[PDB]
Design an enzyme around this catalytic site. Structure first.
Site, mmCIF file in Angstrom:
data_model
loop_
_atom_site.group_PDB
_atom_site.id
_atom_site.type_symbol
_atom_site.label_atom_id
_atom_site.label_comp_id
_atom_site.label_asym_id
_atom_site.label_seq_id
_atom_site.Cartn_x
_atom_site.Cartn_y
_atom_site.Cartn_z
ATOM 1 N N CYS A 62 4.160 -5.225 3.929
ATOM 2 C CA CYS A 62 3.614 -4.300 2.913
ATOM 3 C C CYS A 62 3.722 -4.909 1.508
ATOM 4 C CB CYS A 62 4.402 -2.999 2.962
ATOM 5 S SG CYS A 62 3.800 -1.776 1.760
ATOM 6 N N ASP A 128 -7.371 13.666 -2.895
ATOM 7 C CA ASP A 128 -5.970 13.250 -3.262
ATOM 8 C C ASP A 128 -5.758 11.761 -2.945
ATOM 9 O OD1 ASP A 128 -5.058 15.882 -4.170
ATOM 10 O OD2 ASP A 128 -5.059 16.474 -2.012
ATOM 11 N N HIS A 138 -8.891 -6.216 -7.200
ATOM 12 C CA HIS A 138 -9.824 -5.195 -6.660
ATOM 13 C C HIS A 138 -9.863 -3.972 -7.577
ATOM 14 C CE1 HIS A 138 -5.861 -4.751 -4.681
ATOM 15 N NE2 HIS A 138 -6.083 -3.449 -4.849
ATOM 16 N N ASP A 145 -3.371 -11.214 -1.943
ATOM 17 C CA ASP A 145 -2.887 -12.635 -1.901
ATOM 18 C C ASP A 145 -3.692 -13.504 -0.924
ATOM 19 O OD1 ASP A 145 -1.940 -11.406 0.371
ATOM 20 O OD2 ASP A 145 0.060 -12.362 0.297
ATOM 21 N N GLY A 146 -4.853 -13.069 -0.458
ATOM 22 C CA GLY A 146 -5.602 -13.803 0.569
ATOM 23 C C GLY A 146 -5.028 -13.580 1.945
ATOM 24 N N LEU A 150 1.032 -10.312 2.187
ATOM 25 C CA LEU A 150 1.010 -8.817 2.105
ATOM 26 C C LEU A 150 -0.336 -8.320 2.655
ATOM 27 C CD1 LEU A 150 -0.730 -7.820 -0.499
ATOM 28 C CD2 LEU A 150 1.167 -8.841 -1.738
ATOM 29 N N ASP A 164 -3.203 6.893 -3.679
ATOM 30 C CA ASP A 164 -4.309 6.119 -3.080
ATOM 31 C C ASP A 164 -3.777 4.996 -2.167
ATOM 32 O OD1 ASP A 164 -5.841 7.909 -4.650
ATOM 33 O OD2 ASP A 164 -6.787 6.221 -5.842
ATOM 34 N N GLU A 171 -7.638 -9.957 5.270
ATOM 35 C CA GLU A 171 -7.096 -9.879 6.647
ATOM 36 C C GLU A 171 -8.223 -9.537 7.610
ATOM 37 O OE1 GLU A 171 -4.265 -10.999 6.501
ATOM 38 O OE2 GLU A 171 -3.572 -10.294 4.481
ATOM 39 N N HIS A 189 1.971 3.401 7.956
ATOM 40 C CA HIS A 189 3.035 3.007 7.002
ATOM 41 C C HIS A 189 2.566 3.317 5.574
ATOM 42 C CE1 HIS A 189 6.182 0.312 5.319
ATOM 43 N NE2 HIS A 189 5.276 0.205 4.329
ATOM 44 N N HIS A 193 3.985 6.192 2.176
ATOM 45 C CA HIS A 193 4.141 6.034 0.707
ATOM 46 C C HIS A 193 3.305 7.065 -0.049
ATOM 47 C CE1 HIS A 193 6.410 2.316 0.940
ATOM 48 N NE2 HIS A 193 5.380 1.565 1.380
ATOM 49 N N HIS A 199 10.539 2.485 1.362
ATOM 50 C CA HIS A 199 10.913 1.576 2.480
ATOM 51 C C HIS A 199 12.228 1.995 3.127
ATOM 52 C CE1 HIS A 199 7.829 -1.628 1.112
ATOM 53 N NE2 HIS A 199 7.353 -0.736 2.007
HETATM 54 C C1 LIG Z 1 9.487 5.645 -3.153
HETATM 55 C C2 LIG Z 1 8.426 6.162 -4.196
HETATM 56 C C3 LIG Z 1 9.227 6.366 -5.445
HETATM 57 O O1 LIG Z 1 7.865 7.452 -3.761
HETATM 58 C C4 LIG Z 1 7.365 5.173 -4.339
HETATM 59 C C5 LIG Z 1 6.583 4.792 -3.201
HETATM 60 C C6 LIG Z 1 5.581 3.819 -3.269
HETATM 61 C C7 LIG Z 1 5.314 3.240 -4.522
HETATM 62 C C8 LIG Z 1 4.388 2.302 -4.925
HETATM 63 C C9 LIG Z 1 4.700 2.054 -6.311
HETATM 64 C C10 LIG Z 1 4.156 1.201 -7.293
HETATM 65 O O2 LIG Z 1 4.951 0.849 -8.206
HETATM 66 N N1 LIG Z 1 2.908 0.588 -7.253
HETATM 67 C C11 LIG Z 1 1.811 0.824 -6.278
HETATM 68 C C12 LIG Z 1 1.777 -0.332 -5.281
HETATM 69 C C13 LIG Z 1 1.235 -1.583 -5.936
HETATM 70 C C14 LIG Z 1 2.177 -2.277 -6.746
HETATM 71 C C15 LIG Z 1 2.467 -3.588 -6.359
HETATM 72 N N2 LIG Z 1 3.371 -4.382 -7.133
HETATM 73 C C16 LIG Z 1 4.023 -3.823 -8.197
HETATM 74 N N3 LIG Z 1 4.892 -4.514 -8.938
HETATM 75 C C17 LIG Z 1 3.757 -2.521 -8.581
HETATM 76 F F1 LIG Z 1 4.402 -1.921 -9.700
HETATM 77 C C18 LIG Z 1 2.853 -1.718 -7.837
HETATM 78 C C19 LIG Z 1 2.661 -0.421 -8.344
HETATM 79 N N4 LIG Z 1 5.707 2.884 -6.688
HETATM 80 C C20 LIG Z 1 6.101 3.601 -5.606
HETATM 81 C C21 LIG Z 1 7.107 4.484 -5.543
HETATM 82 CA CA LIG Z 2 -11.427 -8.545 6.644
HETATM 83 CA CA LIG Z 3 -5.355 9.826 -5.853
HETATM 84 CA CA LIG Z 4 -2.938 -10.754 2.400
HETATM 85 ZN ZN LIG Z 5 5.423 -0.253 2.337
HETATM 86 ZN ZN LIG Z 6 -4.747 -1.862 -4.989
#
Ligand SMILES: CC(C)(O)c1ccc2cc(C(=O)N3CCCc4cnc(N)c(F)c4C3)[nH]c2c1
Ligand SMILES: [Ca+2]
Ligand SMILES: [Ca+2]
Ligand SMILES: [Ca+2]
Ligand SMILES: [Zn+2]
Ligand SMILES: [Zn+2]
Ligand SMILES: O=P([O-])(O)O
Length: 232
Positions: A62, A128, A138, A145-146, A150, A164, A171, A189, A193, A199
């Site tokens: 992820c 939502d 994107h 990362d290609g 991830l 979202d 992939e 998965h 989130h 995680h």
């Molecule tokens: C556990 C909790 C607090 O509900 C939660 C669950 C999932 C996410 C996803 C993020 C989030 O920070 N991002 C959304 C995922 C994309 C992303 C990737 N790299 C980063 N450094 C980054 F800040 C982000 C921004 N923040 C989150 C926080």
């Molecule tokens: Ca593809």
């Molecule tokens: Ca949304």
């Molecule tokens: Ca990838």
């Molecule tokens: Zn995850």
């Molecule tokens: Zn994105």
């Protein structure tokens, strides 16, 4: 053709370990950050770039961070209504549209049985949970990362981009047999989130960050208890 050491440095940075080591005065050698990663992933706590740690770092996973560099978002990061809507904005060409639709419906059906929420498909920008396939940069400043590495990422509950779910279309998406990653298991998965789950450190749990193909029921006790601690 990154070296093993270059892969380790990139992994520790991307998923937040290096930032936490900086906050603890211990970012000038690899060992302290490696111990933070071994604790978080339930590996042996050696502080060394050993075989188990390198195998973990090479495993597809992820794109959401583990420990640090999470963005500041609006609200308390849970939904405050019962009927969560989703919009499939675009399609990978790797699978028929009806197979992609059913993979997302099945992933929502896994969460619906264990949460007081319902999941309903719409055709509208103000759903939502907006679902998109994208490559590299994107539109949200968190580039993919290609091929491999991830696989996908998602945003915690709230308005706009929050809730979202994005899937890396460099992939090959499948149902996890022959070639390619299971879109059903990755979506399950990522939708965790989008409901507000972090995680898990339990390697068998759906919310563990590494991809693990299975034909068995994907939810574990740790996933069900995680959702219980959010919505009842
Ligand atoms: C556990 C909790 C607090 O509900 C939660 C669950 C999932 C996410 C996803 C993020 C989030 O920070 N991002 C959304 C995922 C994309 C992303 C990737 N790299 C980063 N450094 C980054 F800040 C982000 C921004 N923040 C989150 C926080
Ligand atoms: Ca593809
Ligand atoms: Ca949304
Ligand atoms: Ca990838
Ligand atoms: Zn995850
Ligand atoms: Zn994105
Ligand atoms: O890193 P090793 O010695 O556990 O293979």
């Amino acid at each position: 053709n990154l070296t093993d050491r270059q892969l380790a440095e990139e992994y520790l940075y991307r998923y937040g370990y290096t930032r936490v080591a900086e906050m603890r005065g211990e970012s000038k050698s690899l060992g302290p950050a490696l111990l933070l990663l071994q604790k978080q992933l339930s590996l042996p706590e050696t502080g060394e770039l050993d075989s188990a740690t390198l195998k973990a770092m090479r495993t597809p996973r992820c794109g959401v961070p583990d420990l640090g560099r999470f963005q500041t978002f609006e609200g308390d990061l849970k939904w405050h209504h019962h009927n969560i809507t989703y919009w499939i904005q675009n399609y990978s060409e790797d699978l028929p549209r009806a197979v992609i639709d059913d993979a997302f419906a099945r992933a929502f059906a896994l969460w619906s049985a264990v949460t007081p929420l319902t999941f309903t498909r719409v055709y509208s920008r103000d759903a939502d949970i907006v679902i998109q396939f994208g490559v590299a940069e994107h539109g949200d400043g968190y580039p993919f990362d290609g091929k491999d590495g991830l696989l996908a990422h998602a945003f915690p509950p709230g308005p706009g981009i929050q809730g979202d779910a994005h899937f890396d279309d460099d992939e090959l998406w499948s149902l996890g047999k022959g070639q390619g990653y299971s879109l059903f298991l990755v979506a399950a998965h990522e939708f965790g989130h989008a409901l507000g789950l972090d995680h898990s450190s339990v390697p068998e749990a759906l919310m563990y960050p590494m991809y693990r193909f299975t034909e068995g029921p994907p939810l574990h006790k740790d996933d069900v208890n995680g959702i219980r601690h959010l919505y009842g």
